[PDB]
Symmetry: D2
Subunit: 92 residues, 4 copies
């Protein structure tokens, strides 16, 4: 599912649809995506303190979506992230 | 891999090892985890602006790890997150 | 000047003008202001890494403005902050 | 008081005392300070949601202190910030 989301974001980078939010992000670039990540992270904290589980899930996925858009924008392969996740898993 | 990481974090919540970082987080609770997420998010922004890909990957995975620890702490099932990811995928 | 800014924000809390941004913040409440602070903090980081001094100043003042709005909203006296600043000054 | 804090931080940049936290920040540089600002910002959010006024004040001043350290580090004059605060005041 995470791989599916990443692939979809990658497909938008090659076949741009100005109407789409992902393309809007790619056009505005790195700084726009980073601002979104910071904003979304604050939203996760606020949602968590409000004990709103549905909102925590929406905002956390929002953070993940923007992180993936950022990866694609900086040309960082998803597998590099997955390797790190596996390495981190082993440590634990 | 993401599921593997989550399961491992869940296993630590039931079988505590005070020596482990994950248990340290569960003992300090919600507020400690949230602070980590905010700090890590800032580190992702800084790393991205420094154009340090390796660091972006480490910090992003760091953000994901703490988000998963937070899910376990708030008793939010991983599948709830995955459902949201799939729904988000469909929209795109 | 910081005191002037705070006083002005306080005056808006008592004499609401729906057209104003400050009143918009008070009406939406705590969670809206906090989201703004997180977003603005991310903008400060981004601006600083871009080496854009003018932007750093605008965003930093933005952070300060929202922190003062937050103080007024939570009914925290400015002098309490100033006492802390002075105490911090002495430590240094 | 804010000017006093800034002046004190400036004095530390010229007469370094490795034992001091301010000099520790200047030595580690921009990225360390920015990380602190992000972390502190999260702490302000968490403290505010906890309704802990004393903590909100400590963390907010912490954010201000690190912003001033950042100004000194980037060689941004305090009056530039004050000009912006006054301009912002007039707009209101």
């Amino acid at each position: 599912a995470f791989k599916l989301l990443y692939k979809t974001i990658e497909e938008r980078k090659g076949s741009p649809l100005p109407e789409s939010y992902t393309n809007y992000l790619f056009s505005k670039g790195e700084d726009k995506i980073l601002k979104k990540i910071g904003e979304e992270c604050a939203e996760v904290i606020i949602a968590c303190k409000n004990n709103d589980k549905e909102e925590v899930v929406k905002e956390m996925v929002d953070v993940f979506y923007h992180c993936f858009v950022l990866l694609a924008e900086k040309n960082i392969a998803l597998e590099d992230v997955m390797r790190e996740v596996k390495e981190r898993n082993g440590k634990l």
